[PDB]
Every structure is written in structure tokens, then in C-alpha cells.
Amino acid sequence: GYERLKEELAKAQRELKLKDEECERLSKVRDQLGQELEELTASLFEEAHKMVREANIKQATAEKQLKEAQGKIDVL
Amino acid sequence: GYERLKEELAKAQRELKLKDEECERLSKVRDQLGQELEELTASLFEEAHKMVREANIKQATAEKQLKEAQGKIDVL
Amino acid sequence: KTYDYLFKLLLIGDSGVGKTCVLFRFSEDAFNSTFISTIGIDFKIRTIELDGKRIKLQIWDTAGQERFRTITTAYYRGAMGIMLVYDITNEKSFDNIRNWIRNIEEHASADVEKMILGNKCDVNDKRQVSKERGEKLALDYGIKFMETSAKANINVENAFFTLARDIKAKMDKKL
Numbered sequence: 576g577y578e579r580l581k582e583e584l585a586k587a588q589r590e591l592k593l594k595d596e597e598c599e600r601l602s603k604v605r606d607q608l609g610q611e612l613e614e615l616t617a618s619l620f621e622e623a624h625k626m627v628r629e630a631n632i633k634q635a636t637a638e639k640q641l642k643e644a645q646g647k648i649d650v651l
Numbered sequence: 652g653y654e655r656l657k658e659e660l661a662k663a664q665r666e667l668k669l670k671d672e673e674c675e676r677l678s679k680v681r682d683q684l685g686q687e688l689e690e691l692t693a694s695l696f697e698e699a700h701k702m703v704r705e706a707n708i709k710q711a712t713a714e715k716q717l718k719e720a721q722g723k724i725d726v727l
Numbered sequence: 728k729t730y731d732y733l734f735k736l737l738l739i740g741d742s743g744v745g746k747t748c749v750l751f752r753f754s755e756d757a758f759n760s761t762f763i764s765t766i767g768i769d770f771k772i773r774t775i776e777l778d779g780k781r782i783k784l785q786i787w788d789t790a791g792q793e794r795f796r797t798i799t800t801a802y803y804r805g806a807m808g809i810m811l812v813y814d815i816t817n818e819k820s821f822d823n824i825r826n827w828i829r830n831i832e833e834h835a836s837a838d839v840e841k842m843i844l845g846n847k848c849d850v851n852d853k854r855q856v857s858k859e860r861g862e863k864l865a866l867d868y869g870i871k872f873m874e875t876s877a878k879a880n881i882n883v884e885n886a887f888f889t890l891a892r893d894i895k896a897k898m899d900k901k902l
């Protein structure tokens with residue numbers, strides 16, 4: 576009876592906060608998704624190059640043998 | 652407080668309902684943004700690998716052709 | 728248009744359980760290069776056929792870094808099937824499988840399809856986790872379990888096709 580009112584806002588008090596806290600989050604999302612998407616996209620780009628670079632470095636050195644190491648076959 | 656509790660439990664109930672309704676909207680747009688980020692990042696990875704593969708595909712041919720001549724010199 | 732379906736999948740777990748090879752073997756890459764190490768995300772596509780239809784699988788592999796916390800939720804929240812992956816060479820990986828199950832339950836959706844993947848089953852001589860004890864974890868949580876070797880190439884293709892069947896059978900139910 577007189578304890579049924581206390582059962583409502585002991586509960587509600589714990590409820591309101593929950594949602595109010597949910598939104599605080601859900602609101603910052605669009606900015607985090609973007610402010611992340613960016614970092615990602617950079618990181619992606621940066622690494623993307625590094626990989627392509629190494630690949631090529633080794634295409635060079637493994638072709639200088641075809642010109643200098645074949646010349647060793649031409650010099651023997 | 653019969654009119655106070657029968658009045659406030661309408662406003663308090665609305666708060667939870669207002670936010671409930673506000674939650675779905677906030678969480679709707681977080682799922683919507685997350686799909687759009689999914690498909691964006693899906694494409695970026697797909698390219699980044701695409702690029703990097705071709706930098707490795709050639710590295711193999713060059714190095715492959717060098718094993719084609721490198722073994723015959725070390726054979727003799 | 729072909730394909731005619733799109734399942735979005737996720738790989739999650741402790742680092743060095745070999746989440747990433749497990750992928751690389753399914754997607755059929757000839758190569759090792761990945762961004763998991765450095766970035767903590769990588770991604771792979773493979774379409775398969777199941778009972779005749781084309782099914783495009785987008786597979787995300789997540790590595791927890793807090794750096795991209797938001798983005799990787801987006802993957803959890805949007806994922807149709809997620810594979811929890813431990814190393815049978817390593818306990819805590821297995822112990823944590825519960826922990827992840829938290830995340831999955833907490834960050835991800837209410838009907839998601841779930842699968843515990845006991846990886847490296849090939850290297851029995853360094854085997855700390857019994858399979859029997861593996862299956863019990865799974866059964867407790869009412870989820871499928873499967874032992875797997877990214878390197879011996881054991882059950883990886885089956886693990887996926889099994890999870891893909893489980894996703895589709897669920898969707899075909901909502902005809």
C-alpha cells in the first residue's frame with residue numbers, strides 16, 4: 576500500500592538514468608563513426624602503400640640480377 | 652499526494668516513453684550509419700588488397716624468372 | 728545480377744588464436760599480407776553455393792583494439808554470424824571464450840548465430856584444451872562448436888558452410 580509508491584520510483588529512478596545514459600552514447604556515434612572512418616581510411620592508405628612499396632623494391636633488386644648477375648654469366 | 656502521484660506518474664511514465672521512442676530513433680540511426688560504414692569499408696579493403704596483390708603478382712614473375720636462371724648457374 | 732544473398736560474418740577472439748589464418752584459408756588467398764597486425768581489422772569476401780543459391784559472405788575479422796572501438800561495434804551490431812575462436816594450445820583463450828560471449832551478447836544482436844571454433848586442433852602435441860571440454864562449453868551455451876586447423880586446413884571450409892547454412896535456414900524460416 577504505502578510501500579507501492581516506493582516500488583515505482585526506486586525502479587523508475589533506475590530506469591530513467593538508463594535511457595538518458597543510452598542516448599548520451601547513441602548521440603556521439605555519428606561523430607565517432609566518422610572520426611574513426613577517417614583514421615581507418617588513412618591507416619588503410621598508409622599501409623596500402625608500404626605493402627606496394629616493398630613489393631616493388633624486390634622487383635628491382637630481383638631484376639638487377641638479370642642485368643648484373645647475367646653479366647657475370649656473360650663474363651665467365 | 653493522491654493527485655501528486657497520479658499526476659507525476661503520468662509525466663514520469665512519459666519520460667520513459669518519450670525516451671523509449673527517442674531510443675529507437677537514436678539506435679535506428681546508429682544502425683543505419685553502421686551499414687553505410689560497413690559497405691564503405693568493405694570497398695576500401697577490397698581495393699587495398701586488390702592493389703597489393705598485383706604488386707605481389709609481378710614480384711613473383713620477376714623472382715620466378717630469376718630462379719629459372721639462378722639454379723643453372725649454381726648447378727654449374 | 729548474382730549473388731542472391733548477403734551474409735555478414737564476424738571473426739572474434741584473443742589475438743594469436745589464429746583468427747586471421749582461419750579466414751585467409753576460407754577466402755582462398757595465395758598470400759599472407761594482412762592488416763590485422765598493424766590495424767586490427769581485415770576483411771574478406773567469398774560467395775558460395777548452398778542448395779543452388781549464390782551467397783556472398785562478408786567476413787570481418789576484429790582484434791579488439793580500443794583504437795577503433797566505435798567502428799568495430801558497428802560490425803558486431805550488424806553481424807549475422809559470428810565465430811568465437813580459441814587456441815587449443817592456450818587456455819586463457821578458451822577461458823575468455825566466455826568473456827567474448829559477453830561482448831557478443833552485450834554488443835551484438837539478440838538472434839545472432841554463434842559458433843565456437845577450437846583452432847589449431849592439428850597440433851595435438853601442444854594441446855592444453857580437451858575437445859570434450861570444448862564441446863561442453865558449447866553445449867552449455869547452446870551453440871555449435873568445431874575444432875579447426877588453419878594450417879592443416881581442417882574444418883575451416885566446413886565451419887563456414889555450416890554457419891552459412893545456419894544463417895540461411897533461419898532466414899528461410901521468415902520465408
Ligand SMILES: Nc1nc2c(ncn2[C@@H]2O[C@H](COP(=O)(O)OP(=O)(O)O)[C@@H](O)[C@H]2O)c(=O)[nH]1
Pocket residue numbers: 740741742743744745746747748749763846847848849850875876877878879
Ligand atoms: N599450429 C597452428 N598455428 C596457427 C594456426 N592458426 C594460426 N596459427 C599461428 O598462430 C599465430 C596466430 O594466428 P593469427 O592469424 O595471427 O590469428 P589472430 O592473431 O588471432 O588473428 C600465428 O603465428 C599463426 O602462424 C593453426 O590452426 N595451427
